Amino acid sequence: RNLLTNGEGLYAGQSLDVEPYHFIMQEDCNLVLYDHSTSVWASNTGILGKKGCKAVLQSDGNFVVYDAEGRSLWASHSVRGNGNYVLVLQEDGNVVIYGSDIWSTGTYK
Amino acid sequence: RNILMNDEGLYAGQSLDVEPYHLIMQEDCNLVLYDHSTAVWTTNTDIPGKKGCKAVLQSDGNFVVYDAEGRSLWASHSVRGNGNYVLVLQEDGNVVIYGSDIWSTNTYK
Ligand SMILES: OC[C@H]1O[C@@H](O)[C@@H](O)[C@@H](O)[C@@H]1O
Ligand SMILES: OC[C@H]1O[C@@H](O)[C@@H](O)[C@@H](O)[C@@H]1O
Ligand SMILES: OC[C@H]1O[C@H](O)[C@@H](O)[C@@H](O)[C@@H]1O
Ligand SMILES: OC[C@H]1O[C@H](O)[C@@H](O)[C@@H](O)[C@@H]1O
Ligand SMILES: OC[C@H]1O[C@H](O)[C@@H](O)[C@@H](O)[C@@H]1O
Ligand SMILES: OC[C@H]1O[C@H](O)[C@@H](O)[C@@H](O)[C@@H]1O
Ligand SMILES: OC[C@H]1O[C@H](O)[C@@H](O)[C@@H](O)[C@@H]1O
Protein backbone atom coordinates (compact mmCIF):
# COMPACT_ATOMS: atom_id res chain seq x y z
CA ARG A 1 0.00 0.00 0.00
CA ASN A 2 1.15 3.52 -0.82
CA LEU A 3 -1.86 5.60 0.20
CA LEU A 4 -4.67 6.20 2.67
CA THR A 5 -8.12 7.62 1.97
CA ASN A 6 -10.76 8.96 4.40
CA GLY A 7 -11.13 6.68 7.41
CA GLU A 8 -8.15 4.49 6.60
CA GLY A 9 -5.17 4.25 8.87
CA LEU A 10 -2.13 2.32 10.04
CA TYR A 11 -2.42 0.15 13.16
CA ALA A 12 0.72 -0.67 15.17
CA GLY A 13 3.05 -2.63 12.90
CA GLN A 14 1.35 -1.46 9.70
CA SER A 15 3.03 0.59 6.99
CA LEU A 16 2.99 2.10 3.51
CA ASP A 17 5.80 0.92 1.24
CA VAL A 18 7.16 2.21 -2.07
CA GLU A 19 10.62 1.18 -3.29
CA PRO A 20 12.94 1.24 -0.26
CA TYR A 21 10.73 3.84 1.45
CA HIS A 22 8.77 2.80 4.50
CA PHE A 23 6.22 4.85 6.46
CA ILE A 24 5.21 2.93 9.59
CA MET A 25 3.16 3.24 12.77
CA GLN A 26 5.47 1.42 15.24
CA GLU A 27 4.69 -0.46 18.47
CA ASP A 28 6.44 2.31 20.39
CA CYS A 29 3.84 4.74 19.02
CA ASN A 30 6.39 6.62 16.91
CA LEU A 31 5.39 7.39 13.28
CA VAL A 32 8.53 6.96 11.19
CA LEU A 33 9.64 7.27 7.56
CA TYR A 34 12.63 5.07 6.61
CA ASP A 35 14.89 4.91 3.57
CA HIS A 36 16.06 1.30 3.92
CA SER A 37 16.83 0.96 7.65
CA THR A 38 17.74 4.60 8.07
CA SER A 39 15.19 6.78 9.81
CA VAL A 40 14.50 10.02 7.94
CA TRP A 41 11.53 11.67 9.62
CA ALA A 42 9.48 10.95 12.73
CA SER A 43 6.70 12.35 14.91
CA ASN A 44 9.05 11.97 17.91
CA THR A 45 6.21 10.44 19.89
CA GLY A 46 7.86 7.15 20.77
CA ILE A 47 7.87 5.45 24.17
CA LEU A 48 9.12 1.89 24.59
CA GLY A 49 6.15 -0.28 25.44
CA LYS A 50 3.50 2.19 24.22
CA LYS A 51 1.81 -0.32 21.93
CA GLY A 52 -1.52 -0.19 20.11
CA CYS A 53 -1.35 3.30 18.59
CA LYS A 54 -3.13 4.18 15.32
CA ALA A 55 -2.55 6.75 12.58
CA VAL A 56 -5.65 7.88 10.62
CA LEU A 57 -6.37 10.33 7.76
CA GLN A 58 -9.68 11.94 8.71
CA SER A 59 -12.61 13.66 6.95
CA ASP A 60 -11.35 17.08 8.07
CA GLY A 61 -8.04 16.50 6.32
CA ASN A 62 -6.26 15.95 9.62
CA PHE A 63 -3.76 13.09 9.96
CA VAL A 64 -3.84 11.94 13.58
CA VAL A 65 -2.08 9.39 15.82
CA TYR A 66 -4.18 8.01 18.72
CA ASP A 67 -3.21 5.75 21.63
CA ALA A 68 -4.67 2.38 22.71
CA GLU A 69 -7.48 4.49 24.15
CA GLY A 70 -8.40 7.08 21.57
CA ARG A 71 -6.41 9.98 22.91
CA SER A 72 -4.49 12.05 20.39
CA LEU A 73 -0.68 12.13 20.51
CA TRP A 74 0.28 13.90 17.32
CA ALA A 75 -1.43 15.48 14.34
CA SER A 76 -0.33 17.33 11.22
CA HIS A 77 -3.02 19.83 12.22
CA SER A 78 -3.99 20.21 8.60
CA VAL A 79 -7.73 20.45 9.29
CA ARG A 80 -9.43 22.16 6.36
CA GLY A 81 -13.02 21.02 6.78
CA ASN A 82 -15.10 18.05 5.70
CA GLY A 83 -14.18 16.56 2.34
CA ASN A 84 -12.20 13.81 0.64
CA TYR A 85 -8.48 13.55 1.25
CA VAL A 86 -5.61 11.18 0.68
CA LEU A 87 -2.14 10.61 2.15
CA VAL A 88 0.52 9.29 -0.18
CA LEU A 89 4.03 7.94 0.20
CA GLN A 90 5.56 9.26 -3.02
CA GLU A 91 8.35 7.86 -5.18
CA ASP A 92 10.32 11.01 -4.40
CA GLY A 93 10.52 10.23 -0.68
CA ASN A 94 7.90 12.80 0.29
CA VAL A 95 4.73 11.99 2.27
CA VAL A 96 1.86 14.26 1.23
CA ILE A 97 -1.79 14.92 2.06
CA TYR A 98 -3.81 16.17 -0.94
CA GLY A 99 -6.42 18.94 -1.08
CA SER A 100 -9.85 17.54 -1.79
CA ASP A 101 -11.42 15.91 -4.81
CA ILE A 102 -11.70 18.24 -7.79
CA TRP A 103 -12.86 15.56 -10.25
CA SER A 104 -13.83 11.87 -10.42
CA THR A 105 -15.41 9.35 -12.84
CA GLY A 106 -17.95 8.50 -10.17
CA THR A 107 -17.58 4.77 -10.77
CA TYR A 108 -17.44 3.66 -7.14
CA LYS A 109 -19.12 0.30 -6.62
CA ARG B 1 0.96 1.64 -10.82
CA ASN B 2 -2.15 3.21 -9.27
CA ILE B 3 -1.53 6.97 -9.48
CA LEU B 4 -0.36 9.78 -11.75
CA MET B 5 1.24 12.95 -10.43
CA ASN B 6 1.80 16.40 -11.94
CA ASP B 7 2.79 16.02 -15.59
CA GLU B 8 2.87 12.23 -15.63
CA GLY B 9 0.85 10.33 -18.18
CA LEU B 10 -0.37 7.06 -19.65
CA TYR B 11 1.04 6.30 -23.09
CA ALA B 12 -0.38 3.97 -25.70
CA GLY B 13 -0.56 0.54 -24.10
CA GLN B 14 0.08 1.78 -20.57
CA SER B 15 -2.28 1.48 -17.63
CA LEU B 16 -3.02 1.86 -13.92
CA ASP B 17 -4.02 -1.43 -12.33
CA VAL B 18 -5.85 -1.99 -9.07
CA GLU B 19 -7.30 -5.43 -9.77
CA PRO B 20 -10.05 -5.91 -10.80
CA TYR B 21 -10.00 -2.34 -12.19
CA HIS B 22 -7.88 -1.22 -15.16
CA LEU B 23 -7.49 2.28 -16.55
CA ILE B 24 -5.82 1.88 -19.92
CA MET B 25 -4.80 4.32 -22.65
CA GLN B 26 -5.49 2.02 -25.62
CA GLU B 27 -3.71 1.92 -28.99
CA ASP B 28 -6.96 3.19 -30.56
CA CYS B 29 -6.69 6.46 -28.59
CA ASN B 30 -9.58 5.59 -26.33
CA LEU B 31 -9.04 5.91 -22.57
CA VAL B 32 -11.08 3.22 -20.85
CA LEU B 33 -11.83 1.99 -17.33
CA TYR B 34 -12.65 -1.70 -17.09
CA ASP B 35 -14.13 -3.69 -14.21
CA HIS B 36 -12.62 -7.11 -14.91
CA SER B 37 -13.29 -7.19 -18.67
CA THR B 38 -16.30 -4.86 -18.79
CA ALA B 39 -15.92 -1.23 -19.80
CA VAL B 40 -17.58 1.09 -17.29
CA TRP B 41 -16.05 4.44 -18.20
CA THR B 42 -14.57 5.91 -21.35
CA THR B 43 -13.20 9.12 -22.75
CA ASN B 44 -14.95 8.15 -25.98
CA THR B 45 -12.00 9.19 -28.13
CA ASP B 46 -11.49 6.14 -30.33
CA ILE B 47 -11.68 8.46 -33.37
CA PRO B 48 -10.85 6.78 -36.71
CA GLY B 49 -7.30 7.41 -37.89
CA LYS B 50 -6.01 8.30 -34.42
CA LYS B 51 -3.09 6.48 -32.83
CA GLY B 52 -0.33 7.19 -30.30
CA CYS B 53 -2.41 9.31 -27.92
CA LYS B 54 -1.51 9.99 -24.30
CA ALA B 55 -3.47 10.83 -21.14
CA VAL B 56 -1.76 13.34 -18.84
CA LEU B 57 -2.49 14.89 -15.47
CA GLN B 58 -1.61 18.56 -15.79
CA SER B 59 -0.05 20.95 -13.31
CA ASP B 60 -3.23 23.04 -13.49
CA GLY B 61 -5.42 20.18 -12.29
CA ASN B 62 -6.79 19.36 -15.71
CA PHE B 63 -6.66 15.77 -16.99
CA VAL B 64 -6.46 15.69 -20.78
CA VAL B 65 -6.16 13.11 -23.59
CA TYR B 66 -3.91 14.31 -26.42
CA ASP B 67 -3.38 12.98 -29.94
CA ALA B 68 0.05 12.40 -31.49
CA GLU B 69 0.07 16.02 -32.66
CA GLY B 70 -0.76 17.46 -29.25
CA ARG B 71 -4.43 18.21 -29.87
CA SER B 72 -7.02 18.06 -27.07
CA LEU B 73 -9.23 15.10 -27.82
CA TRP B 74 -10.75 15.11 -24.33
CA ALA B 75 -10.50 16.81 -20.94
CA SER B 76 -11.88 16.57 -17.40
CA HIS B 77 -12.12 20.36 -17.42
CA SER B 78 -10.85 20.22 -13.86
CA VAL B 79 -8.62 23.27 -14.17
CA ARG B 80 -8.06 24.85 -10.76
CA GLY B 81 -4.83 26.75 -11.22
CA ASN B 82 -1.25 25.73 -10.55
CA GLY B 83 -0.40 23.39 -7.71
CA ASN B 84 0.21 19.73 -6.94
CA TYR B 85 -2.35 17.13 -7.94
CA VAL B 86 -2.70 13.39 -8.07
CA LEU B 87 -5.01 11.11 -10.00
CA VAL B 88 -5.62 7.71 -8.45
CA LEU B 89 -7.42 4.46 -9.31
CA GLN B 90 -9.05 3.59 -5.98
CA GLU B 91 -9.92 0.16 -4.62
CA ASP B 92 -13.59 1.14 -4.81
CA GLY B 93 -13.42 1.39 -8.60
CA ASN B 94 -13.50 5.19 -8.66
CA VAL B 95 -10.87 7.33 -10.46
CA VAL B 96 -10.17 10.50 -8.46
CA ILE B 97 -8.06 13.65 -8.83
CA TYR B 98 -7.11 15.09 -5.43
CA GLY B 99 -6.46 18.81 -5.65
CA SER B 100 -3.37 20.44 -4.20
CA ASP B 101 -1.27 19.49 -1.19
CA ILE B 102 -2.43 20.69 2.23
CA TRP B 103 0.43 19.11 4.21
CA SER B 104 3.69 17.19 3.82
CA THR B 105 6.66 15.83 5.73
CA ASN B 106 8.81 17.80 3.31
CA THR B 107 11.08 14.81 2.89
CA TYR B 108 11.56 14.74 -0.90
CA LYS B 109 14.95 13.67 -2.25
O1 LIG C 1 13.35 12.94 3.74
C2 LIG C 1 12.94 11.73 3.12
C3 LIG C 1 13.81 11.43 1.93
O4 LIG C 1 15.12 11.91 2.28
C5 LIG C 1 16.08 11.67 1.24
O6 LIG C 1 17.27 12.25 1.62
C7 LIG C 1 16.25 10.17 1.07
O8 LIG C 1 16.66 9.58 2.30
C9 LIG C 1 14.91 9.57 0.63
O10 LIG C 1 15.03 8.17 0.54
C11 LIG C 1 13.81 9.93 1.64
O12 LIG C 1 12.55 9.56 1.11
O1 LIG D 1 -16.62 2.28 -25.03
C2 LIG D 1 -15.73 1.23 -24.68
C3 LIG D 1 -15.18 0.55 -25.92
O4 LIG D 1 -15.18 1.53 -26.97
C5 LIG D 1 -14.79 0.97 -28.23
O6 LIG D 1 -14.91 1.95 -29.20
C7 LIG D 1 -13.33 0.48 -28.16
O8 LIG D 1 -12.46 1.59 -27.93
C9 LIG D 1 -13.19 -0.55 -27.03
O10 LIG D 1 -11.82 -0.87 -26.87
C11 LIG D 1 -13.76 -0.01 -25.71
O12 LIG D 1 -13.81 -1.06 -24.76
O1 LIG E 1 14.30 8.92 15.34
C2 LIG E 1 13.77 7.69 14.87
C3 LIG E 1 13.84 6.62 15.94
O4 LIG E 1 13.15 7.14 17.10
C5 LIG E 1 13.15 6.22 18.21
O6 LIG E 1 14.47 5.95 18.53
C7 LIG E 1 12.44 4.91 17.84
O8 LIG E 1 11.07 5.15 17.56
C9 LIG E 1 13.13 4.30 16.61
O10 LIG E 1 12.42 3.15 16.20
C11 LIG E 1 13.18 5.31 15.46
O12 LIG E 1 13.93 4.77 14.38
O1 LIG F 1 -5.48 17.70 17.70
C2 LIG F 1 -6.17 16.56 17.21
C3 LIG F 1 -7.63 16.87 16.92
O4 LIG F 1 -7.65 17.90 15.91
C5 LIG F 1 -8.98 18.35 15.60
O6 LIG F 1 -9.55 18.84 16.77
C7 LIG F 1 -9.83 17.20 15.05
O8 LIG F 1 -9.34 16.80 13.78
C9 LIG F 1 -9.82 16.00 16.01
O10 LIG F 1 -10.42 14.88 15.37
C11 LIG F 1 -8.39 15.63 16.42
O12 LIG F 1 -8.43 14.65 17.46
O1 LIG G 1 -16.18 11.81 -5.48
C2 LIG G 1 -15.03 11.60 -4.67
C3 LIG G 1 -15.24 10.45 -3.69
O4 LIG G 1 -16.17 9.53 -4.29
C5 LIG G 1 -16.55 8.48 -3.39
O6 LIG G 1 -17.11 9.07 -2.27
C7 LIG G 1 -15.32 7.66 -2.98
O8 LIG G 1 -14.81 6.97 -4.11
C9 LIG G 1 -14.25 8.58 -2.39
O10 LIG G 1 -13.06 7.85 -2.13
C11 LIG G 1 -13.94 9.73 -3.34
O12 LIG G 1 -13.03 10.63 -2.72
O1 LIG H 1 -9.38 22.10 -23.02
C2 LIG H 1 -8.16 21.53 -22.57
C3 LIG H 1 -7.18 22.60 -22.13
O4 LIG H 1 -7.65 23.13 -20.87
C5 LIG H 1 -6.83 24.19 -20.35
O6 LIG H 1 -6.84 25.24 -21.25
C7 LIG H 1 -5.39 23.70 -20.14
O8 LIG H 1 -5.37 22.69 -19.14
C9 LIG H 1 -4.83 23.13 -21.45
O10 LIG H 1 -3.53 22.59 -21.23
C11 LIG H 1 -5.76 22.04 -21.98
O12 LIG H 1 -5.29 21.57 -23.23
O1 LIG I 1 5.15 20.36 -0.80
C2 LIG I 1 4.40 19.40 -1.53
C3 LIG I 1 5.15 18.97 -2.78
O4 LIG I 1 6.53 18.76 -2.40
C5 LIG I 1 7.37 18.56 -3.55
O6 LIG I 1 7.25 19.68 -4.36
C7 LIG I 1 6.93 17.31 -4.32
O8 LIG I 1 7.17 16.16 -3.53
C9 LIG I 1 5.44 17.40 -4.68
O10 LIG I 1 5.01 16.18 -5.25
C11 LIG I 1 4.60 17.70 -3.43
O12 LIG I 1 3.24 17.88 -3.79
Edge-first strand listing for the sheet containing B63-66 = B9-11, B54-57, B63-66, B72-75
- β partners of residue B98: A101, B86
Q: What architecture is the A1-109 domain classified under in CATH? A: Orthogonal Prism (2.90)
Question: Would you give the DSSP letter of residue B30?
Answer: -
> Inter-chain contact A103–B93, Cβ cutoff 8 Å?
no
- The Cα B39–Cα B31 span in angstroms is 10
Question: In three state form, how does the secondary structure of chain A look?
Answer: CCEEECCCEEECCCEEEECCEEEEECCCCCEEEEECCEEEEECCCCCCCCCCCEEEECCCCCEEEECCCCCEEEECCCCCCCCCCEEEECCCCCEEEECCEEEECCCCC
The ligand that comes nearest to the alpha carbon of residue B109 is 1
> Inter-chain contact B33–A97, Cβ cutoff 8 Å?
no
How far off is chain B from A69, nearest CA to CA, in Å?
A: 26
Is B106's Cβ below 8 Å from some Cβ in A?
Answer: yes
Spell out the domain ranges in chain A: 1-109
Experimentally determined by = X-ray
Q: Nearest by CB to B98, which of A76, A98, A108?
A: A98
Q: Nearest by CB to A92, which of B40, B61, B108?
A: B108
- Pocket residue to mutate for ligand 3, from A23, A24, A25, A28, most atoms within 8 A of Cβ: A28
> Inter-chain contact B103–A78, Cβ cutoff 8 Å?
yes
Are the C-beta atoms of residues A59 and A82 closer than 8 Å to each other?
A: yes
Amino acid at A87: L
- The Cα A71–Cα A54 span in angstroms is 10
**Atom 3, ligand 5: which residue's CA is nearest?**
A84
Task: Report which ligand 1 atom has the smallest distance to the Cα of A33.
Answer: 2
> Inter-chain contact B92–A108, Cβ cutoff 8 Å?
yes
Resolution limit, Å: 2.2
Using CA coordinates, name the residue in chain A closest to B98: A101
Are the C-beta atoms of residues A73 and B1 closer than 8 Å to each other?
A: no
Q: How far is the CA of A32 from the centre of ligand 6 (A)?
A: 39
